[PDB]
Swiss-Prot record:
GO cellular component: extracellular region
GO molecular function: metal ion binding; MHC class II protein binding; toxin activity
The keyword Secreted is assigned to this record: yes
Effect of residue 183 to A: Almost 10-fold reduction of the binding to major histocompatibility complex (MHC) class II
Subcellular compartments: Secreted
Lineage: Bacteria, Bacillati, Bacillota, Bacilli, Bacillales
More about this protein: This toxin seems to be coded by a bacteriophage.
Gene: entA
Disulphide bonds in the chain: 92-102
Cofactors required: Zn(2+)
Family: Belongs to the staphylococcal/streptococcal toxin family.
Textual note on the cofactor: Binds 1 zinc ion per subunit. The zinc ion is necessary for the toxin interaction with MHC class II.
Keyword tags: Disulfide bond, Enterotoxin, Metal-binding, Secreted, Signal, Superantigen, Toxin, Zinc
Protein name: Enterotoxin type A
């Protein structure tokens, strides 16, 4: 947890710098989008080498997961895995033509990954430097090693609900800059600029999760820095 005054100095992209439909499409992803959330699944099918193809995942009927590389694919190919991420259909290719949804990362190993009790992830939130209280129930997980994507999706859904994050200025979105930090103790902290995604559609806005980054959920909290300028 940094001084809101120091974070304010990083070059965070401003909301006014989003070209086109990216803003409407960021609100769609973090607020309206359906997510793939299932446990105990396995697949050794692929389309390209850096992907794992879940045939008939949907009961879209196929789910194609994309990773940074084959090296990552290999840790999950043929294993029992849990899935939690956002998917899309626009620009998606790889399985039953016309019936494949695509997702970036969101895969964790299923075995021995269940928690003693569900973890409520604490969140520290600052708005223009004033600390705001966030209910403990906001972000929760049952995984011991969880994807940053699973936590970010929960965190941003709340920022949208309570702070109109991805609403236009006219529809009361007052936040112009922001940073989310997953503050881990034992491993490097991940931080994302809330207005820093690239492209305007899901196929590119969601690539930030392609790395399948996973962290230990115990002993960490989330720091959120929001600014109205």
């Amino acid at each position: 947890s940094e001084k809101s005054e120091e974070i304010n100095e990083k070059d965070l992209r401003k909301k006014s710098e989003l070209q086109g439909t990216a803003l409407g499409n960021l609100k769609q992803i973090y607020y309206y989008n359906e997510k793939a959330k299932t446990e105990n699944k396995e697949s050794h099918d692929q389309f390209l080498q850096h992907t794992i193809l879940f045939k008939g995942f949907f009961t879209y009927n196929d789910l194609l997961v994309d990773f940074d590389s084959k090296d990552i694919v290999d840790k999950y190919k043929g294993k029992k895995v849990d899935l939690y991420g956002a998917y899309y259909g626009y620009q998606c290719a790889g399985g039953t033509p016309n019936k494949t949804a695509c997702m970036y990362g969101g895969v964790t190993l299923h075995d021995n990954n269940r928690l003693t009790e569900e973890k409520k992830v604490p969140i520290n939130l600052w708005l223009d430097g004033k600390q705001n209280t966030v209910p403990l129930e906001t972000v929760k997980t049952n995984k011991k090693n969880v994807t940053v994507q699973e936590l970010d999706l929960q965190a941003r859904r709340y920022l949208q609900e309570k702070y109109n994050l991805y609403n236009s200025d006219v529809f009361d979105g007052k936040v112009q800059r922001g940073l989310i930090v997953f503050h881990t103790s034992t491993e490097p902290s991940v931080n994302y600029d809330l207005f820093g995604a690239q492209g305007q559609y899901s196929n590119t806005l969601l690539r930030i999760y392609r790395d399948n980054k996973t962290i230990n959920s115990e002993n960490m909290h989330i720091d959120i820095y929001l600014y109205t300028s």
